[PDB]
Amino acid sequence: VNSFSGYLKLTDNVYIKNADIVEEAKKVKPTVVVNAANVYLKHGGGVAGALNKATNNAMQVESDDYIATNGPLKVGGSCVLSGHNLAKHCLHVVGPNVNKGEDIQLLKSAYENFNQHEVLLAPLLSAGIFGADPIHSLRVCVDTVRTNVYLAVFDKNLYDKLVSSFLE
Numbered sequence: 001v002n003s004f005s006g007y008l009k010l011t012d013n014v015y016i017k018n019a020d021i022v023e024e025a026k027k028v029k030p031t032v033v034v035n036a037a038n039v040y041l042k043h044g045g046g047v048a049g050a051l052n053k054a055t056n057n058a059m060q061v062e063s064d065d066y067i068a069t070n071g072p073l074k075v076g077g078s079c080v081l082s083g084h085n086l087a088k089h090c091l092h093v094v095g096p097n098v099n100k101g102e103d104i105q106l107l108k109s110a111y112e113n114f115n116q117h118e119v120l121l122a123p124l125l126s127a128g129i130f131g132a133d134p135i136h137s138l139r140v141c142v143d144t145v146r147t148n149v150y151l152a153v154f155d156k157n158l159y160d161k162l163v164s165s166f167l168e
């Protein structure tokens, strides 16, 4: 149904809300939810752990089966697997982990995976355990994504700083 409500429109195609991405997935019933994936699709932490727990581990079971046959993703890459109970599809997208020395330039590649989907529910890529500056990640999103992206930021403080920064 893609029933997004209460988003702030930043550009013609990028929207943002102070919300929990799992609660958004349940309310919105999106065609695609984006996962903040790692190359091995091990969803023990971060946004990935929240999405996987909300699927009662079905996302991890499917991901383990996928990797054993198909091999790992690349940093800046993506795969499309089931959305389970959250969405029709899950776009697993690997942003660079700058906490572990990966090149922040790969964030552009990472957001280019969104352009194969008309409308997405997504977290801010490379945030949290991935260690990137969130203000920078929002700029790369706005500059790179051409399809409609609905960004869920749960931390109110961070949401307020992102919005303030974007409106400067």
Ligand SMILES: O=C(O)c1ccc(-c2ccccc2)nc1
Residues within 6 Å of the ligand: 001, 002, 029, 030, 031, 032, 083, 084, 085, 086, 087, 088
């Ligand atoms: O046709 C669509 O875009 C579409 C279809 C199903 C869903 C869907 C939503 C929640 C759980 C499973 C699937 N979302 C979007």
